[PDB]
Design a binder for this molecule. Sequence first.
Ligand code: HEM
Ligand SMILES: *[C@@H]1CC(=O)N(C)C1=O
Length: 154
Amino acid sequence: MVLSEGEWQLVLHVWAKVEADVAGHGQDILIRLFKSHPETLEKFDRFKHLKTEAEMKASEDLKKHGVTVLTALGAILKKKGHHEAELKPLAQSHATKHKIPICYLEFISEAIIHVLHSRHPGDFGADAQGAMNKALELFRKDIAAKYKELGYQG
Ligand code: HEM
Ligand SMILES: *[C@@H]1CC(=O)N(C)C1=O
């Protein structure tokens, strides 16, 4: 699958808004993930003690991680599909160390879409949401292929 340049521009135009405050967006996204699919929190030995949204919001460490996650994803999106170099270490760690199934990457993709839809109606209309879905699908497709190369079913 291949996104058009027009599609990449819709992706990067909403990402430009995320970048006004990546820390805020990362908190929203991880909290949405953990609330919508509580099982995902159990993968984080670092964070699985957090009991409530209030505790999550107050966690400086969770905020730090959200910035790390969105910055890595931002770097991937800015490659506009040319993300082989970026996907190698991410696939290896997430397959082998963290053991994150592809379904959980689907869950975080859903969280990203939900947060952008909520925060950014001006840059996340139907066409833009479709482009972001396509970008995130491409990301998961390529990650899943790497998972298989690495010996993880996903
Ligand atoms: C958009 C998809 C994701 C991106 C871009 C991303 C990015 C990252 C990055 C950059 C790191 C630090 C370096 C590394 O270990 O590779 C990391 C760590 C980690 N990721 Fe992800 N991640 C994603 C999805 C997920 C999901 C869905 C889960 C769990 C359901 C997860 C679980 C973890 C865990 C447990 C760590 C180690 C946290 C720690 O103890 O420091 N990741 N991730
Ligand atoms: C998706 C949901 C889950 O718990 N696993 C392990 C999946 O593959």
